[PDB]
Amino acid sequence: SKLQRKNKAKQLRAQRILDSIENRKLFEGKNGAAKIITIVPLVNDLDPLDILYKLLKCADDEGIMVQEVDSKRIFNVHIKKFKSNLKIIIPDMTNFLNILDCAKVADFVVFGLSGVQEVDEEFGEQIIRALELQGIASYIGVISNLSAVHEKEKFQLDVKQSLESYFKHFFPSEERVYNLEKNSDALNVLRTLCQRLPRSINWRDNRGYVVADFVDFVETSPDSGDLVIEGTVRGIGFNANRLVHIPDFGDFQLNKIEKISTVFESNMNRDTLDEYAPEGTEDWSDYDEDFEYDGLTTARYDDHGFLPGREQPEEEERQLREFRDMEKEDREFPDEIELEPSESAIERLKRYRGLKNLYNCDWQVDEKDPSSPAEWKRLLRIGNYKNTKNRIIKETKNEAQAIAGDRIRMFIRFPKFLLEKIQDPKQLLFAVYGLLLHEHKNAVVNFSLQRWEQYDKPVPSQEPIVVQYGVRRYTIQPLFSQGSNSPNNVHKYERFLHPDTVSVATCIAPVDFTQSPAIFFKPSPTDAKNIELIGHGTFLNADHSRILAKRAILTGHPFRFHKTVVTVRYMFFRPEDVEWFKSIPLFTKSGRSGFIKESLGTHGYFKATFDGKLSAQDVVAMSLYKRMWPMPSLPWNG
RNA sequence: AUCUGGUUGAUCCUGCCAGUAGUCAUAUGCUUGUCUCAAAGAUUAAGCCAUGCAUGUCUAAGUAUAAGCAAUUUAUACAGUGAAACUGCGAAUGGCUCAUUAAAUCAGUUAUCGUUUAUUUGAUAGUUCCUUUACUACAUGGUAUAACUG
RNA sequence: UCUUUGAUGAUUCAUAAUAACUUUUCGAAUCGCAUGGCCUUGUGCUGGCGAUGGUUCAUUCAAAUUUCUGCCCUAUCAACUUUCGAUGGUAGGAUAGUGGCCUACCAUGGUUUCAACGGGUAACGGGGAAUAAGGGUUCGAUUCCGGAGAGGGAGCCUGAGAAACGGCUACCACAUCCAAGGAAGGCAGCAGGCGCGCAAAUUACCCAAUCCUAAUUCAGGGAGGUAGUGACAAUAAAUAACGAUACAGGGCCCAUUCGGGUCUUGUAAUUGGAAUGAGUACAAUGUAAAUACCUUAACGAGGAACAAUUGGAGGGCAAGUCUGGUGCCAGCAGCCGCGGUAAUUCCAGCUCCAAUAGCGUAUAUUAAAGUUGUUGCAGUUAAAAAGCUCGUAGUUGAACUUUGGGCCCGGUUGG
RNA sequence: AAAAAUUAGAGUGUUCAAAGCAGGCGUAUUGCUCGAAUAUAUUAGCAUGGAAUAAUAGAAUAGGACGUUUGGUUCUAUUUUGUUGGUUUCUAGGACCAUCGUAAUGAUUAAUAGGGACGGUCGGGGGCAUAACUACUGCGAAAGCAUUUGCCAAGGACGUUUUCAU
Structure with missing residues (x-):
């Protein structure tokens, strides 16, 4: 049927x-x-x-x-x-x-x-x-x-x-x-x-978050007391193996969990409850990067070509007085050095790495760099960024000590100097957030810059602005890179927003496992609210193969053009760089290379070969590169 | 009341496959300015159902001591209005679906000298104290409960 | 020097009498208005209009059974029914009442090739619907009338009336709240759900109309009405009409030959002025209140922008001898086919054609189809006459039995 | 006598139309006035006219039909003997019972349908026993059927003023 x-x-x-x-x-x-x-x-x-x-x-x-x-x-x-x-x-x-x-x-x-x-x-x-x-x-x-x-x-x-x-x-x-x-x-x-x-949402859901209903302080010690927090757990829960951040108060260590219609305690398996973890110095102790500039005449490039040559309303006005001056350096002459030589040009800027190639060789990111500060030593670099991403998400559900939808009188070990600015819950919300294993430790990070709509006011890499990621309000100095597809992570160093393409921001800040979107805003009291909405973005990864660039290119006014020697005016009033930069090949900026052999004189006279036209329609050019590092962040309040 | 393309080098046939119009015949694609009229969870799953509604009712004329209101006044039984509750009537009509069912339903056609019927309309009831007026009321017999108080 | 007696085609019919009989049925212990006539004047005696109730006969709205003839495919279903009622007889029980409706004793019947009995149905039946020379083929879940059902079966209470589900009780399948002691439940009514699939609208306003119910003119009604969502179908019909010159031709004519008239277009980002509702919106009208349609102040166009779209351009079948791909972006268009560069079909530009709100594609059905043939087909060689004669049912069967003659009245038609 | 709606359709300026069942006329001054038709048996039942076509019954052993030929056997009493009941006499009034009378007493042809007899023949027809003639043509329901002699039955056609009425 x-x-x-x-x-x-x-x-x-x-x-x-x-x-x-x-x-x-x-x-x-x-x-x-x-x-x-x-x-x-x-x-x-x-x-x-x-x-x-x-x-x-x-x-x-x-x-x-x-x-x-x-x-x-x-x-x-x-x-x-x-x-x-x-x-x-x-x-x-x-x-x-x-x-x-x-x-x-x-x-x-x-x-x-x-x-x-x-x-x-x-x-x-x-x-x-x-x-x-x-x-x-x-x-x-x-x-x-x-x-x-x-x-x-x-x-x-x-x-x-x-x-x-x-x-x-x-x-x-x-x-x-x-x-x-x-x-x-x-x-x-x-x-x-x-x-x-x-x-x-995805990221806030899968970590656990409780809103407070009753917050009262009880005494454990004059060094540190305890706060009872009454609420209902949302998200996945709160367990005694990691930390909890609340904004404008920060990070505090729990002690016990009690579900009141399961009495749990905090074990001694805590992490490094500090800012600069000492577990970073016993991982990198090799003294094998010795790019030096103290007596180096020309940078040694014996693996890159020819033989070397040796010798025997008051807030806006302060910020735009040198802002639009870099249009000569960033936009119309992007590869340029400043030169109007009447001073002692014998020693004006010296320490450099002027190799010609970009994307086919090795460059040691770590050096014994004097521009590399004390962040470079006592930090952990767990350099595998794909399996460690997927490891931490699996362990959390296995350490399930608190299930969602429970009435908890949550206790937490808490100091005594912060018993004042917490108001009653009826006039203000009070929420917490589950912090993963080893997130508050500062390290290197990388962001992305989506430019704000109808706002083409750029910002250089020299401002510790507050960038919102997750819930964390952190002021941070950003440095900006590109996202060019190349299998070495050597991209172009830009200083501002690239107004065409989504830019990449290199930073030094604690890690964000949630892959939360980034928010670029400026806290300034110009608006009645302390916010200037200047951008947005998201977090991608923590990079270890970055090689940044710093450009300084010697171009000027050419007048004399012979097939092997080219003399350029307003360049050499003190000729030293012609004998200082033998293994840095000159090249005409029309895409034509050249060869530097000897200093043919004192006012621009040097041996210079040309691949195309021999005339003063284009200036022979150099290429210079350096490396420096960003600054760490700080949790911003107020 | 009408036919055209396709078997062979060429022609006449049997013969089917394209084409061509209609649909109160359902979906679907791209478009869409005006007036009049308007179907719409049937097909498959007569599968499952959160919340609100769809059935109650009073006249001068069955029962009012509301500790209701109106007070207003001819009224010492009551008489103006009028909640709650007893009694009476209705809830068997309407609305929705098409699962079953093949001499069953159902149609046009007969029969009740073979039966029940609220209502409506029209007729219809001197005889009934043991009595023909002898004890024992007919100027009128008896308890019980509702709303309400606690 | 002494009888009456109804009605029907038909009765033991209506109706009357005699003996009785009965957990003795009915024969006004109710209510509003008015307030008069008579007297020995006693609150003496009589007396108006009408509400509700009541027994039986008639009647109206009904109900329950019953007579004759009529249903789609199937023989790869030929014999079926009768312990356990199947067909009939006699007597009881039960019902509102007839009857195997049930129970006792007996008889052995009843249905069938004129198709019983069994199987399928993606089957509720009819009024009706689409197509149509005539005959016909295919549909009918769905506005009216008839039946059935309320998650699936069974049982009963109250009532004139229900085997009722916006009544109750059991088991079966479900599923809701719980202080764990218990307690509650049926959207195939109206709006609305998360399910399914190619497939189907708002948790809106009101009793003003139509009509039903109640003790009643007044209360009630998701019945029903009014709007929102609606390219399901059907009717009416905007997207331009008039001049000037201009330059052309044709054109009829003055033609001498011109231009003398009459025309017709053609076009001239050549030039002019008139008309108007799509839209907006004071008022009024509509309506239960509103919204919209009819009416109407002020506003509203050269319209180049207030700008029509779907499908095709070898053949069937109206429309191209047009240029461009290195075959960017080739099977290829219902069926014959076109591709192997430049194609008289693919991919695009231009110009033409057809319908104008496309019937564009898909799936069913009807005409075309004399390819279901009663009207009306096919016999040898094209699909198709059984190996051969006797013989059931079914269909079909010679001729013949009062014709002719005569008279006469009275119809409407050519007249 | 076969409900309305729908279908064919008469009347009727919804501003035309699909629809609807409305509407028209005067003094508009207290008014009169026409409509809302008709057709569509389309099986079975009911009432009625006609006697072609095609079926069916009637007298053959006459228990046939008509008769006021005559003999009977029964069954009813309506009526009158006011009336009542108790009797039977007729009388009418039902059927059945013999024989005595008159009518012209009563039977359709004989299919160039079919069967059945009857007379002379014909054939490699069949059963028992004991090639040539073979096409030009012979026989049998078909497959099939060839040496002479005799038995046993069958069959077509022809011939006929026989018979039965498929």
Whole structure:
């Protein structure tokens, strides 16, 4: 008979309809749920407490809104209709930084709009562009009040269609805007947040994060006490083998874990709880790089060609006074040295490595470089960057000591000088983050630079700006490289944004295992909020094969052109570099090489061969290269 | 009330495969300015279902001491309005789907001298104290419970 | 010097009497309004309109059974039914009531080549729907009437009426809350779900209309109405119309020959002015309130931008002798086929053709099809007459039995 | 007598149309007024007209049909003997029972359908016993069928003023 359906049906789908259950139904509504809800107003004159009271009048209790009015920004409310509990938060618009993390704790973001204006670019539209570029879960756009447009009906219709504007180019994934003045539109905004949960972010999810409910200090010692933290664990958990960072306080060491309706402690398998770990000096102790410049006449290149020749409003003005001067050096003459020689040009700049080739030989990154500071010695370089990436993600679930959705009175070993600036949780959120094994140790890192939209003001490599990665607010001096496809990682050193191609930023900072996107902003009080949004990007890897370049190219005014000797004017008033740079072959900048043999005189006269035209339409050129290193970072607060 | 291309060097046939129009016949591709009229979870799974609604009802004329209101006044039984609750009636109509079912359903056609029927419309009831008026009310017999208080 | 008696085609029918019989049925211990007439004047006696209830006969809305004839493919289903009711007789039980409906004793019947009985159905039946010279072929889950069902089977309560599921109770399959003691559940009603697949709309406003229910004019109604989403289908029809010169030709004519008239175009980023709704929007009207359509202030074009699109250009089948690929970006277009450079088909530019809101492609079905043949095909050589004669059912079967003659009335037609 | 809707269709300026069932006229001053048709047995049942075509029954052993030929056997009592019940006399009124009378008493042809007899013949037809003639043509339902003699039965055609009515 025709039970063969119930064969083929109930034996095609039985496990494919099983892979997606408990992630959806761990939120059953008496004890096991906590839905985290954030509300962002998009104009400065809004009452989100009233928007809350437009979201709860349709909930069929009555005595929930009136007693919760005075000064509270965190709410925990149980919905006795769809049987779910919510965690309703609301930040403070006077600060900007608090807005940027109240999104990234949540999964549904209530986007309010305005029925009297449009959005503003630098503050509303940028904060929309802020959260989607750092990554966010799903959301709902909404309008609170539509009383202001005149009480005829058709005029209150089309003003919705105008407000669709920022969901045609921003998102082709959301077409409705719910009018909360309508009672029947204000209910399926309550249906969806009590009954769904979206694909959230990748990196914040897979590490564990708890929001605080009760924070109190207890005494263990006058050197260090303890803080009890009450909350519910989200993410994957918190175990006693690694560390925890909280912003504006930093990193602190736990002691014990207790789940209160499993008593755990911290073992002695801690990591190096310091900034500059002493486990880096017993890995590199070889004295085998001796590129020297103390008595070297010409850099030894005996493996690169010919025989050598031996002898027997007050903030902006200080920053742009030498900014646009480098257009002569970066853009119109990119390969150039500064020369108007009337001074003692016998010893003006000497220490160099002027080899001609770029991408076919060896260059020792590590040297005994006097430009290489004390970071270069006591640091660990675990140089395998693919298996160690995939090792750390596997071990974490195996050391599962805390499962998600638990009521914890979390204790932590904590000092005594930081018992003041933590406020009550009702006026400010308090969250923690699970820090992996050996992340806080500083090392070398590499970023990527996505240039900010309609902002072509470049920035040199000499500014310790704060770059947001993960949750960490760290000021850091960046240096910039290219991402050219070559099997040696010798790329071009640039100093600014390359306005055409996504640039690569080399840095020295603690490692980020989460592969979090990078955020380039400038803290300056020019804007009322202490942010100048200047860029964004992401982290890729930690590099060990970098060879940077420093250009200094001797070009000037040529006048004399013989087939073997070429004399160039305003060059040699003190001829020393012609006898100092024998094994650095000259070349015409039209792509034609040449040979330097001897100093034929004193004012530009040297032996110079030409491959093409012998005339003063192009200047013979040199090539110089050096190597220096970035500066480490610092955790920025305030 | 109509036919055209294809077997052979060339021709007449049997013969099928392309073509050609229609569909209140369903999907699908690219396009899309106006007026009138409008089908729409049937096919496959008569598979599973979060939340809210879809069945209640009073006149001058069955029962009011609301510790209801209105007070307003001819009214010492009550009389204005009128929650709750008992009693009466309805909930068997309507709406939705097409799984079963092949002399079954169902159609046009007969039969009840072979039966039940709220309602509606029209008729219809001096006889019934042991009595023809002898004890024992007909100017009128008896308990029990609801709402409500605690 | 003494009888009445209904109706039907038909009755032991209606209806009446006599003896009785019964856990003795019904025969107003209810309610609003009015307030009068009579008197020995006693709260004496009578007396109006109508609400609700009541037994039986008629009646209306019904219900339950029943008579005759009528269904798609299949013999690779020829014999089926009768212990355990199958066909009939007699007496009881049960029901609103007839009847093997059930129970006792007996008889041995009933269906079948004019297809019983069994198997398939991606089968609810009809009114009807598409195509059509005539005959026909293929559909009908779906606005009206009839039946069945409420996750799957069974059982009963209250009632005039239900084997009811927005009633209850059991087992079967499910699945919800839980202080673990227990307690609750049926979207094939309306909106809406996460499932499936080629495949199908809003958790909106109201009882104003249509009609139903209630103790009732007043309350109720996802029944039903109004909008949102809708290239499912069907009707009406914007995307330009008029001049001037100009230069051409044809053109009829003055033609002498010119130009004397009449024309027709052709074009001249040659030049002019008039018309108008798509759209916007004061008012009014619409409507239960609104939205839109009809009406109408002010606004609204050289339109080059307020800009039509799908498919083809050997043949069938309307449309090219056109230039470009080193075969950038070659099987190749339903079927004959075109490629081996430059192609009278691929890939692109230009110019033409067809429909104008494309019927462009896919899958079913109808005409074409006299290729299902009753109307109406095919016999030797093309697919196709059984090895041979007797013989079932089925179909088909010679001729013959009152014709002719005469008279006369009364129809509408050519007249 | 076969419901409405739909289909063919009459009337009717929704501004035309698909639709709808409306609408038209005066003084517009308290009004009169026409509509909402008709057709479509399309099996089976019901009422009715006609007697072609094609079936079916009737008298052959006459228990045949008509008769007021005559003898019977029965069964009913409506009526009158006011009336009532108790009797039978007729009388009508039902059937069946012999024989006595008159009608012209009562049987379709004999298929250039079929069967059955009958008379003279013909044939390598078949069974038992004891080549040449073979094509030009012989016989048998077919496959098939050749030396003479005799038995046993069968069969076509012809001939006929026989018979039965497939």
